[PDB]
Amino acid sequence: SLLEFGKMILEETGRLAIPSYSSYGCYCGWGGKGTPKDATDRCCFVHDCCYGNLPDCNPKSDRYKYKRVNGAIVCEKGTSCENRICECDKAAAICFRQNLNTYSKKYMLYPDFLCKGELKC
């Protein structure tokens, strides 16, 4: 669930999921339209494409457990859903960290009319 996803985000990046990654670019948030604008925006694009392969589960709320092993995120075992949802989240949070370098405030509260292509997954 987003309660776990938000925890990984704050752990890996130090920024809170809400402002920092809830209104960033064309895909970090809920609107989802156009072409990713940067490294961080693509992490977000890939992430909900990941939630896309999980029709039989509900990512927003089923909670899973994870823990670190030698500092790395590891998804504890559980139901197939809990595990796949967690992998989607794990990767995304790591992706936000590897790109903390190009994270710019110019992409926050980005306007809808600047989100461009037709892109599906």
Next chain:
Amino acid sequence: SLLEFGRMILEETGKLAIPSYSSYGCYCGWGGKGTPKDATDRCCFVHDCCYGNLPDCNPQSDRYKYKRVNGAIVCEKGTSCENRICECDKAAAICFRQNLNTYSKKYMLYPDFLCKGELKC
């Protein structure tokens, strides 16, 4: 479109396009700088050069139709675009399987950061 591409990849490699390939090496996923890490990575590179030679088309989005005859991918006839795109995708997918034996988890979620400079495709 990514829809045809992504599942072309699972038909050939057995892996789901997203985790396995969305962020592999320096050119898998989107991304575009650096000297390709390995064979798999070289395919993403070549695939990018391929999309790059279709200025008149929208590669990431146009849906094309393809069939498998006697286990081989065959691009059905459509527009000039749908056909050239399909071939780009088929070439990448097939390459992916040819190099499955060198696929290294060591490169999934690779720091785009470590990749510097633009190779002449």
